Amino acid sequence: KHSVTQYLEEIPQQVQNRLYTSPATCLAIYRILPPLAKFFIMAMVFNENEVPLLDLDKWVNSNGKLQFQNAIKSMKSLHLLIPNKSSGTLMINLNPTFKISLRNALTGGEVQNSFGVVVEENVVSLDLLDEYSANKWETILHFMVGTPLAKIPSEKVLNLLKHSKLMEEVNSTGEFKITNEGFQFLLQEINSQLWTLLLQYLKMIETSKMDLVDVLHFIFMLGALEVGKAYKIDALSETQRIMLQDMRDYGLVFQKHSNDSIFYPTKLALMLTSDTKTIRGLKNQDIPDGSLIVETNFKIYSYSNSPLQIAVLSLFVHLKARFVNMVLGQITRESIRRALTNGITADQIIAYLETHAHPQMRRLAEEKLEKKLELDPNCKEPLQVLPPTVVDQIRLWQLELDRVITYEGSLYSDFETSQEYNLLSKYAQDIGVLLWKDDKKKKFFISKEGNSQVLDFAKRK
């Protein structure tokens, strides 16, 4: 988890304070925080007198009071609060801007931005655009995955992917295929897919029109609700418009055509901070949408399917014979080499497959599990929960296929004594260069380019 929070906190306070104007964000980020934060924030939310510290520690009893640190670190980490060690104590209060940025929002303040959604005549249909972006939102996966349909045609979007370079494919030939990031691309479907990308916008977002609130606000304003109009008409900065253009271009925004309106709030924006139900021509029903068979017979077992996720699942198994709702494809010791041909371990595969395609394998989780949870100490010999038999073989083949590690560069060789190692190689294991730390080796390893602190101290020894 990249934990967008981590991206968030990267910036200094003035920028943080810059952003806290848009109230919904303050609320949005409020959701982000661990509960203690959420808790104590309220505790300070409506008392306009900075407060000591031990009191808060005196709020918590024993075990769990570590989260206090995990709490207080976080808030301090982004410095929402302002410490005051005036009287030796810590007099504390939020960034009042942010605090009022909340309170105003919390009790109907002057939030024109967070309340930028100017509702209008609702022309939105449920199936209306339900995949209308979902197509573009799905096709991009294929276009990213590399498939029959040019679902990844966004020149900016592609240039984003190329700029993002998270995909392991031949950009020289144009490919940005399943790298580990591509594998990760397969990994975090919605929360991962959205966020994992969204930063790419920021990743590309460095050149012109910083306007981060007008950027971020365009996000959480989207993250707010399907207000449709009242902003896309006017209530958005030009940075919003480009973001609006980008959002629709990213698909993540439910903006219709004609380039003059308030775009609808596509479901994605809900999914952006949902962590809830996420599924959604006219046939759109799950959970069986992802349909497949998991078992120790090394094959495709597919009645239902996601007509891309299949070829996605193929990315570790050879397609041999497509049929209407089934395909002959043998996922075997041979097939797994492909995920290693890309290189990524199919370890993500395990739980995901133990999580996905079970819609077609629901009788499986009882033909296999038998709920072998409480009978654990009554039998020395459990039964396939969760099915490891191929997974062991996988884990077997895992090393068995991998079975090597290579290094390259120069080779430092035949050192002198136990300082350069136990002065500056556990210190190379303390300044992050080494590509081998074998103490007695008297020889150590890096990657050729990586010496800026490697031909520097052993000379000094």
Q: Give the nearest distance from C-beta 354 to another protein in angstroms.
A: 18
The C-alpha torsion from 195 through 199 and 201 to 202, rounded to 10°, is 150
When asked if residue 31 is in the footprint of another protein (CB under 8 A), the reply is yes
Tokens of 353: 């497959």
Give the residue with the Cβ less far from another protein, 45 or 53: 45
Q: Give the nearest distance from C-beta 24 to another protein in angstroms.
A: 7
Neighbours of 82 (CB within 10 A): 15
Give CA–CA dist 294/315, Å, rounded: 16
Neighbours of 30 (CB within 10 A): 19
Q: Which residues contact 105 (CB under 8 A, 6 or more apart)?
A: 23, 24, 26, 27, 111, 114
With CB under 8 A, what is the number of residues at the site for another protein?
37
When asked if residue 29 is in the footprint of another protein (CB under 8 A), the reply is no
The C-alpha torsion from 76 through 80 and 85 to 89, rounded to 10°, is -80
When asked if residue 369 is in the footprint of another protein (CB under 8 A), the reply is no
Give the residue with the Cβ less far from another protein, 44 or 204: 44
**Which span (44-52, 139-147, 294-302, 414-422) binds another protein, by CB under 8 A?**
44-52
Q: Which of 55, 120, 175, 275 binds another protein (CB under 8 A)?
A: 275
Give the residue with the Cβ less far from another protein, 60 or 82: 60
Residue type for 92, please? I
Give CA–CA dist 394/346, Å, rounded: 8
Q: Which of 2, 3, 12, 64 binds another protein (CB under 8 A)?
A: 64
Give CA–CA dist 241/262, Å, rounded: 10
Q: Residues, the chain, total? A: 461
When asked if residue 80 is in the footprint of another protein (CB under 8 A), the reply is no
Q: Which residues contact 166 (CB under 8 A, 6 or more apart)?
A: 176, 179, 181, 182, 184, 185, 196, 200
When asked if residue 71 is in the footprint of another protein (CB under 8 A), the reply is no
What DSSP designation does 108 have? T
When asked if residue 108 is in the footprint of another protein (CB under 8 A), the reply is yes
Residues between 111 and 150 that touch another protein (CB under 8 A)? 111, 114-115, 117, 119
Q: Which of 5, 67, 180, 447 binds another protein (CB under 8 A)?
A: 67
Give CA–CA dist 235/371, Å, rounded: 55
When asked if residue 378 is in the footprint of another protein (CB under 8 A), the reply is yes
**Which span (84-92, 100-108, 346-354, 450-458) binds another protein, by CB under 8 A?**
100-108
Interface contacts to another protein, rule CB under 8 A = 24, 27, 30-31, 35-36, 38-39, 42-43, 45-47, 58-61, 63-65, 67, 105-108, 111, 114-115, 117, 119, 224-225, 227, 274-276, 378
